[PDB]
Amino acid sequence: YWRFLALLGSALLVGFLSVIFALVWVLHYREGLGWDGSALEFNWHPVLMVTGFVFIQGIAIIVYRLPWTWKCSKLLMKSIHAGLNAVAAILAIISVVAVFENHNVNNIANMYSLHSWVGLIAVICYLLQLLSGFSVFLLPWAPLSLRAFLMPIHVYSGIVIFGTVIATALMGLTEKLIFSLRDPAYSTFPPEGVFVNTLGLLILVFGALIFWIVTRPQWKRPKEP
Amino acid sequence: YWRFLALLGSALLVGFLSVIFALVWVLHYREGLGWDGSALEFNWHPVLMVTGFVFIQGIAIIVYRLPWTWKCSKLLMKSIHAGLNAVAAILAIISVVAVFENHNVNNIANMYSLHSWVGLIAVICYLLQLLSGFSVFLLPWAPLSLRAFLMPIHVYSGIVIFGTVIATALMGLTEKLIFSLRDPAYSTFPPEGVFVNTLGLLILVFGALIFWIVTRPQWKRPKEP
Ligand code: HEM
Ligand code: HEM
Ligand code: HEM
Ligand code: HEM
């Protein structure tokens, strides 16, 4: 228990510092936020991706392992899981609408990067996991046999989508640092560069923590009757 | 069994195509290979990283789950594991010596990027997992109690290092594409750009496959007497 608490506490801390770091970066180092800057719009992209796709999704993935929930309703904890993942799907979609509207308004090319390829698949895989998870594991009519062998795919896919989001995030930080830190150049170790590398590491440590919590068999929600 | 075979076969295929794709890219799209180009030297970096740190390490991680090995010697399969990981440690170190020698000869800055921060920690964590794994699990004097609770950390850390290498690789592809595809620009969808994005996806699919194999409890090497 109290090593779980300490680990949950650590992941919340690093997860909140990531969101904090993403906000300071766009509000104090970049131009800020707005729904047409248009770089004030683009900046919603990293902010909302860190906040929903990395942080809120990180918490949805461990929601069933909070021991205060074990003798809670399984339908209820399915609802918090479903709902916390839906919030991150909304924010991530909004996040992608930000780049497309900044790009199209500014006549920039779309979908040429490995970041955007990996990312757009992450997003599509995410919605499919959300739609499939809703009709099979929340919704009532599905055959309990189809439950039995979709479940290993669903647990694996969620960890693998969550890992791929983190790898897309560090790619997006990389692109945006390189595009932006032209003078002083990124390679000159400017403060924005040290700061956002540290945001990169924080997003890293958060994933490692979420992956630790979620693979402790002693912390699985105890199977139902 | 035969779904394991098919999955092992798939991961070997995508793992070999990654190495192939990394070679074609530097030999047919870039300047080629050499031990002083000096871009002929830098190119050893992605080639050796994909080959040893992603591919050979991907195979070392699943070496205990080959069913042809289950009634093999555990000391022997510890030796293939140890040895396959040592080969990737050598290649990765060599790979890092390539960038430092290209940078220092060409007066480029070192260790300013998130790619290099994450990567250098991956490398250091890798060697520590290798040194710790050698003295605790190959070597004979360690208390069987210290075996018992280092093992969960060692399995977790190997998956987490392997994931972080993949995320570093896609960052390195991102940087190198952006630095290089200046004219025709990356954003103009040039063939090198489509090709190396596809190398990025292949490295992705390889990790997802290695992670699938390595988390099937039905495929764990059956515990010893
Ligand atoms: C993209 C969205 C989703 C992701 C990434 C996701 C991811 C995951 C992950 C990683 C686990 C294993 C966590 C654990 O061991 O506690 C899990 C468990 C589960 N998910 Fe989801 N999930 C998503 C959407 C849904 C939805 C909509 C439902 C519908 C009810 C659902 C139902 C479940 C159930 C029943 C479990 C097993 C709970 C248990 O351990 O007893 N998921 N999910
Ligand atoms: C990890 C979650 C993320 C996902 C799923 C994601 C997904 C995407 C997608 C689909 C695009 C293409 C949009 C377009 O073509 O207009 C894109 C573009 C971009 N993203 Fe992200 N992104 C994520 C995180 C980040 C972060 C944290 C940053 C850092 C600022 C970032 C920086 C960028 C930049 C600069 C572009 C435009 C250049 C390009 O097309 O590659 N992204 N992202
Ligand atoms: C950086 C290098 C290393 C990495 C990334 C690594 C990674 C891993 C991973 C991911 C597993 C779990 C695989 C599975 O379930 O089959 C594992 C298992 C193991 N590793 Fe390592 N390892 C490394 C070095 C070593 C070394 C040097 C030894 C020394 C003998 C060692 C001994 C073991 C043992 C005994 C197991 C458990 C085998 C079993 O399932 O019965 N590893 N390693
Ligand atoms: C995934 C395994 C990888 C690791 C552990 C890794 C690690 C590193 C390290 C430590 C550096 C800094 C070297 C220096 O400062 O001179 C670096 C630089 C670099 N890497 Fe990688 N790398 C990997 C994969 C890749 C790949 C696949 C590419 C694609 C070509 C790449 C491209 C670069 C580039 C262009 C640099 C120099 C610019 C910079 O300092 O960021 N790397 N890498």
Author numbering:
A (entry chain A), B (entry chain A): 6 to 230
How is this structure described in the published paper?
Human enteric ferric reductase Dcytb is a member of the cytochrome b561 (Cytb561) protein family, all of which are ascorbate-dependent oxidoreductases that are homo-dimeric, integral membrane proteins in which each monomer possesses six transmembrane helices and two heme b groups. Dcytb utilizes ascorbate in cytoplasm as an electron donor to reduce apical Fe3+. Since DMT-1 favors the absorption of divalent metal including Fe2+13, the reduction of Fe3+ to Fe2+ by Dcytb in the duodenum is essential for effective intestinal iron absorption.
The resulting crystal belongs to the C2 space group and allowed collection of X-ray diffraction data to a resolution of 2.6 Å. The structure derived from these data was determined by molecular replacement on the basis of the structure reported for Arabidopsis thaliana Cytochrome b561 (AtCytb561), which exhibits 36% sequence identity with human Dcytb. Although full-length Dcytb (residues 1–286) was used for crystallization, the atomic model includes only residues 6–230 because the electron density map for the five N-terminal residues and the 56 C-terminal residues was disordered. The two heme b groups of each Dcytb monomer are sandwiched between four central transmembrane helices (α2−α5) at the apical (or luminal) and cytoplasmic ends of the structure and are referred to as such. As expected from the electronic absorption spectrum, each heme is hexacoordinate with H86 and H159 coordinating the iron of the cytoplasmic heme and H50 and H120 coordinating the apical heme iron. The A-propionate of the cytoplasmic heme forms a salt-bridge with the side chain of R70 from α2, and the corresponding D-propionate is exposed to the solvent. The closest edge-to-edge distance between the two heme groups within a monomer is 15.5 Å.
